Design a binder for this molecule. Structure first.
Ligand SMILES: N#Cc1ccc2c(Oc3ccc(F)cc3OCCn3ccc(=O)[nH]c3=O)cc(F)cc2c1
Ligand SMILES: [Mg+2]
Lengths: 407, 546
């Protein structure tokens, strides 16, 4: 029947106010919810339930169909922890496709006591009418317990195909599924379709869509030093500052000789020839940066953190780390979306990509540091989201000035 | 079916029932309490309980007085429920219809039954004169209970749900104690559908009197007045007393704030600045002339009557913003030219350093947020900023920033960038290595600079913090330099405040730095690590040290 579930001791049901929604999204939710009620997957609730979880609509990339989405991040934190191993082959696999398997979660009912914590309200425009209140009677998409309770069933479903294709790597994230192989894209899509039919037979409005990745093409962006022939004072100033900053990551970096070139009060625009010893110090620093930082390895217990910097010209930089200066990954995106019209969209696309890369590699989403004011992000971030999950984030309202280092 | 399903209510987890002894009151008071109380039991509102129930709640109270009960203790024990949004529909969103009838509900709370097992916790013992009678020990939603509003509203919702589906032509907006209905059918059919709905309410025990003809338009809603084709706030009043007190300010600001919804140009900043302390509502604070002028200007606009149109989804939604100055911004949202759906005002969020562009952006989000709430869609923006001004700003900003689809409007004062800092050093411009220090024990300090040309300066300061000297060292370099100058500093604090690109600050020194930046043609600000022996930075740091 159902599996028992309770909140972490001392934690009440999640109560989060429903942010105002656009009329288009309000209508889409009413239609989705109205049909789901007919399907019995959700049912009305009276005032007795004081809990509330935010809900809003989204449309997957290249998708004309609205998908209901519920912000269970507060419920997930309150939900008691369970008790999946994360395969490393995905990152190496030539191709990894994502499939929205959240539909299967609806087949399994959920405990009655926990159903009160799934309450979400469909808002009303201009406070004209009291919003509609719903509650999940089944495993709700976007919940932490949903992929876990169904996990055993997913394995039994995927047992035959897994034996048929052992080289293929399958990883399941809440409401999603990742399948990776090194085969050609044609055969890969065929295998994917075979897996689609596999779920269809054992069973999906969004199961036909497929998101393609190539973790083999993924690479990390390193910190490099510009190689020039005419070094000006300002160049040496900025060059020295960056090196002194990078010293925190790499202790071996030395800036003594470069500082000697700076000795004296001279104009920034004047060109300063580099002493052979200083050129050697730059060479030794250029080498130290071509090598990986020592003692840097992902710790499963520590949560991932991600920072994004707006470099300009439609270019963005991000670093994923678990410790202040121990960087596990570093890269830069370019031309994501609205490259030269809307940053909020580029940052929303960047947050998505980073999370995807984080999931493929460490099976969990980082905590994002968003270079954006809170009101700016909260107002439009819903309009450009194209994913079933929602990571954590906070805002950095202080000018870093270190973006030049992460160039 | 007359019976209305009752909502299950449970006391707070691990919480006991409320028991509060009734306070002894006058005999004439108890002589009337037992009077109305008997009627309520005859009506079925309340039922006498046996001595077994231990819970109790105090009972206190033109021609006669009314009863009351303080269930706050009971409310604390009562469980939390979903609360109806306190927001009230704004008329600017209300769409136009041919007829509109308002059906009030009589004794909605008393009409709604209560959870059976929860009735034990509503016991209120009745007082006896001179203790000469045994103490007299709710069956429906009691007045003043925490869950009463939500239960009554939630009960109504399920009641109205069938009628809505059966008659989709009628639109019924739901508000506390009221039920607003409008329709575009013929006047006879509207009155007909109104009666059908009233009967559906009676079938569940709900009185919405039509016998007493429902108030015909105009209708004066609690917020403002409404008409068949227009909406306006209740008329404002101006005391014009020679001397105003603290409570005078709030009343004037509050009344003026309500006027800003339809009447553009309202200004309350000067008035608010006067009541900075706002210590006591009784305290009297003298009026300032700048604030007095604000009232004079407000009085002018208030004289002319203004009205707003209702929303037509067919028409586009337009929002126009102008800069009033001193952190004040007025906006208008209109579908048709010259006819405004609504008007509002925005004030600068508290901060130490700001500029015009950011404040404009903030207003958009404030307008955008309100628009999605009242209509569900973002408006097109008419903004007083050149497209090139914005492109330069948002592209160069270090943070992500965006403004929805917008057009330029030539109405001054236009938003502009007062100064722009070069991204590369100005060749052939004197370079100013600056530094400044100050003793922690003694506020005394100094600030100076050095240049490639040999120029130098050191100035002793008093009552200055270390950061102030770091900014002070920059002020000097700006004054003693030409139109084009490069400045090298080690103060990240000063840099973080200039890379914020402000045009007006709460620190007079910043403004004076802004004033020189406005004067100069080109300025390039660089940063070098302190105590790193970088160029003259060590030379300038030593001269200002201690
Ligand atoms: N007091 C009071 C009162 C009366 C009717 C109200 C109302 O009634 C309406 C109910 C449904 C609807 F679609 C549209 C309404 O009014 C649209 C605006 N309006 C109104 C009156 C009129 O003569 N012409 C007109 O256009 C909706 C509403 F929120 C609040 C109301 C508050
Ligand atoms: Mg110093």
């Amino acid at each position: 029947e159902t599996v028992p579930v309770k909140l972490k001791p001392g934690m009440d049901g999640p109560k989060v106010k429903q942010w105002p929604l656009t009329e288009e999204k309000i209508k889409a939710l009413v239609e989705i919810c109205t049909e789901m009620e007919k399907e019995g997957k959700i049912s009305k609730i009276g005032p007795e339930n004081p809990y509330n979880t935010p809900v809003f609509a989204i449309k997957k990339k290249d998708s004309t169909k609205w998908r209901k989405l519920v912000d269970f991040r507060e419920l997930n934190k309150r939900t008691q922890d369970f008790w999946i191993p994360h395969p490393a082959g995905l990152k190496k696999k030539k191709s990894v496709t994502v499939l929205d398997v959240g539909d299967a979660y609806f087949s399994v009912p959920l405990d009655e006591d926990f159903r009160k914590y799934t309450a979400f309200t469909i808002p009303s425009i201009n406070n004209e009418t009291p919003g509609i209140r719903y509650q999940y009677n089944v495993l709700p998409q976007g919940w932490k317990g949903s992929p876990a309770i169904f996990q055993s069933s997913m394995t039994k479903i995927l047992e035959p195909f897994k034996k048929q294709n052992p080289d293929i790597v399958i990883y399941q994230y809440m409401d999603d599924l990742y399948v990776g192989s090194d085969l050609e894209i044609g055969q890969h899509r065929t295998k994917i379709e075979e897996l689609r039919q596999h779920l269809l037979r054992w069973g999906p409005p969004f199961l036909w869509m497929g998101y393609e990745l190539h973790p083999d093409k993924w690479t990390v962006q390193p910190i490099v030093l510009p190689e020039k022939d005419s070094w000006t004072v300002n160049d040496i100033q900025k060059l020295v500052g960056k090196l002194n900053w990078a010293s925190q990551i790499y202790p071996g970096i030395k800036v003594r000789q470069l500082s000697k070139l700076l000795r004296g009060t001279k104009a920034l625009t004047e060109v300063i020839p580099l002493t052979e010893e200083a050129e050697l110090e730059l060479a030794e620093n250029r080498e130290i940066l071509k090598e990986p930082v020592h003692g840097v390895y992902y710790d499963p217990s520590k949560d991932l953190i991600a920072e994004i910097q707006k470099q300009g010209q439609g270019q963005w930089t991000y670093q994923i780390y678990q410790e202040p200066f121990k960087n596990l990954k570093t890269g830069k995106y370019a031309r994501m979306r609205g490259a030269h019209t809307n940053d909020v969209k580029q940052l929303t696309e960047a947050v998505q990509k980073i999370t995807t890369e984080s999931i493929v590699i460490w099976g969990k989403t980082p905590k994002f540091k968003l270079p954006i004011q809170k009101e700016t992000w909260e107002t439009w971030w819903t309009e450009y989201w194209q994913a079933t999950w929602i990571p954590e984030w906070e805002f950095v309202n202080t000018p870093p000035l270190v973006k030049l280092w992460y160039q | 079916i007359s019976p209305i399903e009752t909502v299950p209510v449970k006391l707070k987890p691990g919480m006991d029932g409320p028991k509060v002894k009734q306070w002894p009151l006058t005999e004439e008071k108890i002589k009337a309490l037992v009077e109305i109380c008997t009627e309520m039991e005859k009506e079925g509102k309340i039922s006498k309980i046996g001595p077994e129930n231990p819970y109790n709640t105090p009972v206190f109270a033109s021609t006669k007085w009314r009863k009351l009960v303080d269930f706050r203790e009971l409310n604390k024990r009562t469980q939390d429920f979903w609360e109806v949004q306190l927001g009230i529909p704004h008329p600017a969103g209300l769409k136009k219809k041919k007829s509109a009838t308002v059906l009030d509900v009589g004794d909605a709370y008393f009409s709604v039954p209560l959870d059976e097992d929860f009735r034990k916790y509503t016991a209120f013992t009745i007082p006896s004169i001179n203790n000469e009678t045994p103490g007299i020990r709710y069956n429906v939603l009691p007045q003043g209970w925490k869950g009463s509003p939500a239960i009554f509203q939630s009960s109504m919702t399920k009641i109205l749900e069938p009628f809505a589906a059966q008659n989709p032509d009628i639109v019924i907006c739901q508000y506390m104690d009221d039920l607003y209905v409008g329709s575009d059918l013929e006047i006879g059919q509207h009155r007909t559908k109104i009666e059908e709905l009233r009967q559906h309410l009676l079938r569940w025990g709900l009185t919405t009197p039509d016998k007493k003809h429902q108030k015909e338009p105009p209708f004066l809603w609690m917020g403002y007045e409404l008409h068949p084709d227009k909406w306006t706030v209740q008329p404002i009043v101006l005391p014009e007393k020679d001397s105003w007190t603290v409570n005078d300010i709030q009343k004037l600001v509050g009344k003026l704030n309500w006027a800003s919804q339809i009447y553009p140009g309202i200004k309350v900043r000067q008035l608010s600045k006067l009541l900075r302390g706002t210590k006591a509502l009784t305290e009297v604070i003298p009026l300032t002339e700048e604030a007095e002028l604000e009232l004079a200007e407000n009085r002018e606009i208030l004289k002319e009557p203004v009205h707003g149109v209702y929303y037509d989804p067919s028409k586009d939604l337009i929002a126009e913003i102008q800069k009033q100055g001193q952190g004040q911004w007025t906006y208008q949202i209109y579908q048709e030219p010259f006819k405004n759906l609504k008007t509002g005002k925005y004030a600068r969020m508290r901060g130490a350093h700001t500029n015009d562009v950011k404040q404009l952006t903030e207003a958009v989000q404030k307008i955008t947020t309100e628009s999605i709430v009242i209509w569900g869609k973002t408006p097109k923006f008419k903004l007083p900023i050149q497209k090139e001004t914005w492109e330069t700003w948002w592209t160069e900003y270090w943070q992500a920033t965006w403004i929805p689809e917008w057009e330029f409007v030539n109405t001054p004062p236009l938003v502009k960038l007062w100064y722009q800092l070069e991204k590369e050093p100005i060749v052939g411009a004197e370079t100013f290595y600056v530094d400044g220090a100050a003793n922690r024990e003694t506020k005394l300090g100094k600030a100076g600079y050095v240049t490639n040309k040999g120029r130098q300066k050191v100035v002793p300061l008093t009552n200055t913090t270390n950061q102030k000297t770091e900014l002070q060292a920059i002020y000097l370099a700006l004054q003693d330099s030409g139109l084009e100058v490069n400045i090298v500093t080690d103060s990240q604090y000063a840099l973080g405040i200039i890379q914020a690109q402000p045009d007006k600050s709460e620190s007079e020194l910043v403004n004076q730095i802004i004033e020189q930046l406005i004067k100069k043609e080109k300025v390039y600000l660089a940063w070098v690590p302190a105590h790193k022996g970088i160029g003259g930075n060590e030379q300038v740091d030593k001269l200002v040290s201690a």
